[PDB]
Symmetry: C2
Subunit: 196 residues, 2 copies
Amino acid sequence: LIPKVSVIVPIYNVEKYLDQCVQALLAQTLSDIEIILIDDESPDNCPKICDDYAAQYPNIKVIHKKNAGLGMACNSGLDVATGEYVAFCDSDDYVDSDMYMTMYNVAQKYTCDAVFTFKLYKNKNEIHTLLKDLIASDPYAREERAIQVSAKVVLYRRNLIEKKHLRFVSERILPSEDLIFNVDVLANSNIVCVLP
Amino acid sequence: LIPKVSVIVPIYNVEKYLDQCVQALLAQTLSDIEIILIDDESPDNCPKICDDYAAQYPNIKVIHKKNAGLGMACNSGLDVATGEYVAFCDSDDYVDSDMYMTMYNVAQKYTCDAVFTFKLYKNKNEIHTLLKDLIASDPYAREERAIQVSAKVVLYRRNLIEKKHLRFVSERILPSEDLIFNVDVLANSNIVCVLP
């Protein structure tokens, strides 16, 4: 009925990586995956490659936009996403087929609001403490947290994002847009897990 | 004898803008400026442009490096800077003739550890209050604070950076590298001011 995970892929001049990427998402072990391709006015052949996929498969949604950046692209993806969970995958990244299964199962077991990249944070208080490292004096602890919090592979409970109206800030305004979005999620969550 | 301000210029494929950039730096009203050109193994003719400038002016230092990125390039500049204050200048920016004078004076008057982008944060406690918005619930306050903290032009009290050996993380490892470095500085400062 409702997709288990919506995977949004922001696309811009990656025609040499796209196929392997979408094909890795199509090979996932987890069922009911909704794949969303956002063509941010890609100069190469990605626009047709997206149509080809949307035509050859039933779980692939596509949107062709006038160029506006990856952050805004991910947002368009979120607007059409319908899965219980949502995630972002870079064009130049072909993921391991057991990946989403692993993250989904974990998130379902502990009712997570987000699963990063073993530690479980049961309340916003424990999460808050995790975030304090970003603004305390110690550089290394801040570097460590920023790195962790900026992990590329993250699974978010979609309704937390919608309820909180969380969206990416354009990278053209904030180059650290991905980190900020992740903090938006963490500072507004209750339960969070971090995988090895 | 020691320079007032050290301007670090990370260089890569900017042959067409380098002259105007260095010249804008030479035309500054401030008297003791140390210009540090970090040739990040540029493919064009920037390496020779760099040698020609160091050979013509004694206050211009050049470092020919193996490619490693902008963050690492800034670190290389910090490794050799000697000015009382330091700043980073994008190769494609042609700066106003009195920009550094103005920030130097401002810095000297309130004994700032950093001058951004009128506000004056007198102590750690005030600066910390500022950093709190980056991790609190409200997405808007975090966005705005992150935007100002990510101001492109900032004058840093060099001794602060050296005493805490603050350094940039590679953009290749952490995209938010610029924001993180300014947070390192802020979280370790007494007195910080923002220019309107």
